[PDB]
Structures are given as C-alpha cells and as structure tokens.
C-alpha cells in the first residue's frame, strides 16, 4: 500500500573529479557516483497512473540546471528590468553529462514501461525502480537534442490536445542527426547541416501521427514572430549560444539536398531560466562544432475556428521544463508507509 509523494530527490552521475568541464564540476559537489547494479522489480498485475505535466521532478531539474548555469556560464550583465547585476565573463568548457535522479529512504520511483505511454494515464507494465536513466541537461528550443527515443511509434505528448495553445512534445522513434559548426570573415557566422531526405521522412511520419488524432490535413509553417529564442532553433554549444534559422526545416518544401541552416552566435540573449536578458563574452577561437541527435520536436498548433481543412503546426519551445518533461515523463514518486 502506497500513495503519492513529493520529496527533495538526489542526483547521481559518473562525473569525473578531474575534469575542467562544468557539468562534471557541478555533479562533483552536488551528486554521488551512479549505482552499479540498478535493481528494478517488474511488479506485474499492477496498474497505476502517471502525469508528466504535474511532475515535481521536472521542477527540481529546472532548479538544478538553472543553478548549474549560474555558477558555470556566468553572464557579464544580467537584466530583470530593475536588477542590473554585472559580473566577470570567463570562458568555460561545456558539455552536458548524464544525470540520474533517485529517491531517499522510504520513498521510491515508479516507472511506467508501457512502450506507448502517452504521458498521462494508466499503465500495466510498471516496475519498482531505484534511479532514473542518465538524462543530459540539454537546453534547447524547437528541437529536443541528445535525449531518449520512443521505442515503438511516435508519441504525441500534450496536456490537452483538443485545446489550442498548449505546447506539444513530439517524441521521435528514429533520431535525425544535426551537425552545427562555426568555421575558422565573421566569427558569429555559423551553420547546421542536416539530411533533407531523412528529415522529410520523419516530418512526414510526424504528419501521419498528427492525422491519427485530428482528421485534417497537417501543414508545417515557420513561426510568424515571437522572440528569437522561439522563432529560431536556440541551443547552447560549448558555452556559445547558437540561433539557427529553421525556415528550411518547417516550410513543407524540404528537399532532397543536404540542408544548410544559417546560424548566428549572439552575445545578447533572452534568458530561459527566468524573466530578463543576459550578455556573454564574444565566442572562443578555433572551430566550434556540435553534432546532436534530434530525438524530439516542440510544436504549437495553429488554432482558430478551423473549419479550414489544413491544420498548421509551427515550432516553438520556450518552457525549458518541457525539455526535462520529455525525459522524466515515465517517473512518478511514491512513499511506503
């Protein structure tokens, strides 16, 4: 007999104590080594419910990643409209590492192993687990990078589908590699390469998975104009902040060719951690490169009294908690009394 619970969880990672990289430095003074033998108990004849959208584990990771960037990627100037804090700006070795989340004494984690678990609802396959899988705190918009993959079909995640402005998390079952690079002109000029045939295939597969829910024609369109972090593919690569134009990825005219998305490394950004803006030093020297798995897509549907046949979807993230949701969705905490 056990019901729900909410507790201050602890973290675990294979973080090296000698590494200069800040994800290791943070997990060295905040986490412990991973558990060698992860005992998992496939408790069958069990049926309990989960909710990724009301999961406090997502709130805890949001804190830990914010505090990580706070002591690591220290912005030179920070704005909240009022507070104008001005700090030193040294460069940093940056590369996310897996982060396991586990429970204290008395509490424990339940994992829903139904391979089509859509985020909310009951599961039969539920096992008694001890820690979560190694999640890399990759912060990004539009495209989920370097995460886990849906084992069977594409999982369309949301809180209320048939309600309009609620962010969608498309969980792909096959990765599509994206290869972003700043060469060695302009130091801020950069670009990502991505195979068009494979991106067309998966976006076609996502369009079919969207037709199973809504009996209409699915169309992709670039966002009409929010902030730059929402309209473009915004991600952090080795400290430097990339803004990559994805018009060529979400215009329904994705072609055969290897697509080169124009990118830029901007110094003044809007902060994902909270309200306000930050400023960082100009980018480092040499060649800056990040090769990433695209494991998920963040979408927002075009609403309105859609007696129209076409249903338009546009890329947009914004809420970084949803990034930790697409990895922590299969984890609910309980308490044995």
């Amino acid at each position, epitope marked *: 007999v056990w019901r729900d619970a909410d507790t201050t969880l602890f973290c675990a990672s294979d973080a090296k104590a000698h590494e200069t990289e800040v994800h290791n430095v943070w997990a060295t003074h905040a986490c412990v080594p991973t558990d060698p033998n992860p005992q998992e108990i496939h408790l069958v004849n069990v049926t309990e419910n989960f909710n990724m959208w009301k999961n406090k584990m997502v709130e805890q990771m949001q804190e830990d990643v914010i505090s990580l960037w706070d002591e690591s990627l220290k912005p030179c100037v920070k704005l909240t409209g009022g507070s104008v804090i001005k700090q030193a700006c040294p460069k940093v070795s940056f590369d996310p590492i897996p982060i396991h989340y586990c429970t204290p004494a008395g509490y424990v984690i339940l994992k829903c192993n139904d391979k089509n678990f859509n985020g909310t609802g009951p599961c039969k396959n539920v096992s008694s687990v001890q820690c979560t899988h190694g999640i890399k705190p990759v912060v990004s918009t539009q495209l989920l990078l370097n995460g886990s993959l849906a084992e069977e079909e594409i999982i369309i995640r949301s809180e209320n589908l048939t309600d309009n402005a609620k962010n969608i998390i498309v969980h792909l079952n096959k990765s599509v*590699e994206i*290869n972003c690079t700043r060469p060695s002109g302009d130091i801020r000029k950069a670009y990502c390469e991505i*195979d068009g045939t*494979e991106w067309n295939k998966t976006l076609t597969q996502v369009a079919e998975k969207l037709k199973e829910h809504f009996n209409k024609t699915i169309v992709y369109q670039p966002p009409s104009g929010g902030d730059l972090e929402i309209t473009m593919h915004h991600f952090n690569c080795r400290g430097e902040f990339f803004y990559c134009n994805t018009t060529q990825l979400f215009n329904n005219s994705v072609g055969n060719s*290897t697509i080169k998305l124009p990118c830029r490394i901007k110094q003044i950004i809007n902060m994902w951690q909270g309200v306000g803006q930050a400023m960082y030093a100009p980018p480092i020297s040499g060649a800056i490169n990040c*090769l990433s*798995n695209i494991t998920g897509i963040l979408l927002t549907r075009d609403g309105g009294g859609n007696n129209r046949s076409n249903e338009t979807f546009r890329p947009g993230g914004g809420n970084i908690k949803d990034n930790w949701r697409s990895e922590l969705y299969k984890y609910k905490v309980v308490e044995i009394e």
Partner: antibody, heavy 126, light 113 residues
Framework: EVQLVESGGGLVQPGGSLRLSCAASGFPFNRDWMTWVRQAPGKGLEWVANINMDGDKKDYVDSVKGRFTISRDNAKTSLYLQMNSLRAGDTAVYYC???????????????????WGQGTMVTVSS | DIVMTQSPDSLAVSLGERATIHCKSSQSVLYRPNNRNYVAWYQQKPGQPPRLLIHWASFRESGVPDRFTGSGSGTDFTLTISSLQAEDVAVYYCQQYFFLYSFGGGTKLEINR
C-alpha cells in the same frame, strides 16, 4: 613520417605459438585505435583484430577467438598479437594498420584503416 | 556478421577506358540518422600493402586522383575509374565498417595493351 614496422614472423610448427610486434612512430600512438589484418598467399584481406587507445576494447574475427590476443604498450608505442594453436589456415602476411575514428551512433567508433605497415610473413608448415 | 561480395572477380580494361567494380553488402550499411554509408575502397598494388582510396562510400582520400569515384547507397556500391592508367593495375577491395570489419573478396584489374 608515419611509420608502422611489423616484427616477429617466420616458420612456426603446426599447433605452435608465435608473437608479432608492431613498432609505431610518427603519430600519437597512445590516442589511436590499431588493428591487425592478414592476407593468405594469393587470397584476400581478412581483418584479424583491433584495439582501442587504452586497451580495454578489443575485437576478434571468429576463426581467431580463443587463441589470438591483441595488446599494446603505449609507453613503447607498440602493438602486439600473441598467436597460439596456429594452423595452416593462419599462414598469411600480417599487416599492422592505424585505425581512424568515425562518427557512428553519435559516438566515436573505429573506422577505416588509413595507414598500413609493410607486413611480416608467418608460415605454418611441417 | 556482414558479408561483402565484389563483382566482377577480375576484369581486363584497355588504357584510357572505364573500369567498373561493384560491391554488395549482405545487409544495409547505410546509417540513416546521418545518411552515411560505412563502406571503404582499398587499392593493393603488386608487392605493396593496401592503400585507402575512398571512405564513407563517396569521399576521396587526399592525393587520390579524380578518376577514382565511389558511389552507391544501402547495399549496392560501385568503384569507377574514369580513364584507366598504367599505374592503376592492382587488386581492389571494398570494406564495410558498420558492424566490426569485413572485406570483399577482391577484384583483380588487369590492363590490356
């Protein structure tokens, strides 16, 4: 320049044992995968074994598991292949080759054989 | 294990003419997330160790002339020599490195003069 020099090799009785060595120079040997590949006289190339920078990752061709051992000495920049229970099918020219890493499954895997030694002849006969 | 089968087993091409060598993999060596084919071509001149010509099916190593061109995808690969030269007489091997390693049987390229 890059230089891989195989050593050992010669006549071995059937069922005997032999150890080959590869003296490498001219490249960060302690950071590269290395491999052994053989060619029986008149026949084609057959990959034998390979090993990573730190010696913890080794792989072998099936007809060789159990009686060959690939190893390395990064302090000596040398690759080794201990052969036991040799038979006529092992008579070949054994090549030492440098492996170039390649992206596969978003990780670093051993790839093409970018540089080759001249080879040493191993003869298994009565 | 992946098996590579080359064709033809041998051929004789006049100087300045086209030489075509095919390679077939038992299963697909095409990794779709990056659209890359894990196939290489090697050249073995008489009395010399093999020499890497082309990696990733279609990418030439530095120094290798333009007349060598690799192509194909999935399980069907081809090495083409556009205008054959005397120095091209050798045995050509294809190799897959998708799962471990394995070589093709080899293709002996004779020159007709």
């Amino acid at each position: 320049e890059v230089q891989l020099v195989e050593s050992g090799g010669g006549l071995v009785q059937p069922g005997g044992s032999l150890r080959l060595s590869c003296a490498a120079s001219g490249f960060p040997f302690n950071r590269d995968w290395m491999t052994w590949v053989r060619q029986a006289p008149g026949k084609g190339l057959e990959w034998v074994a390979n090993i990573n920078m730190d010696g913890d990752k080794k792989d072998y061709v099936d007809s060789v598991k159990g009686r060959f051992t690939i190893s390395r000495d990064n302090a000596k920049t040398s690759l080794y292949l201990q052969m036991n229970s040799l038979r006529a099918g092992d008579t070949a020219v054994y090549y030492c080759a440098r492996i170039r890493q390649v992206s596969k499954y978003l990780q670093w895997y051993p790839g093409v054989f970018e540089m080759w030694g001249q080879g040493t002849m191993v003869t298994v006969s009565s | 294990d992946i098996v590579m089968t080359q064709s033809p087993d041998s051929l004789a091409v006049s100087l300045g003419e086209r030489a075509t060598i095919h390679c077939k993999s038992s299963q697909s060596v095409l990794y779709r997330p990056n659209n890359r084919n894990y196939v290489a071509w090697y050249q073995q001149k008489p009395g010399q160790p093999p020499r890497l010509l082309i990696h990733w099916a279609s990418f030439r190593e530095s120094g290798v002339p333009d007349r060598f061109t690799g192509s194909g995808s999935g399980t069907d690969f081809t090495l083409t020599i556009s205008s054959l030269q005397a120095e091209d007489v050798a045995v050509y091997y294809c190799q897959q490195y998708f799962f471990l390693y394995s070589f093709g049987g080899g293709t002996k390229l004779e020159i007709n003069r």
